[PDB]
């Protein structure tokens with residue numbers, strides 16, 4: 001019964017070491033999940049082997065949700081989460097910043 005753009009936070013499971021394998025995470029929360037579409041991107045390109053958790057929600061249908069994939073970072077490679085949702089007129093993109 002309330003409306004809001006979905007919050008998106010992008011972080012790595014362990015602290016990042018170039019060349020060392022790790023996991024990339026995108027935590028999405030908001031209202032009215034409603035077929036929301038989430039992708040992870042390596043240099044603007046959609047990744048294939050992406051897992052997600054069950055979607056958690058409460059009465060008013062606020063929700064959170066996690067998408068992730070194993071990956072192994074470098075300085076050259078650009079990583080990001082991309083979300084598609086009714087409240088968005090276009091796909092929203094948050095970049096993974098290992099210092100932020």
Ligand SMILES: [Cu+2]
Nearest residue numbers: 001002003031
């Ligand atoms: Cu609502």
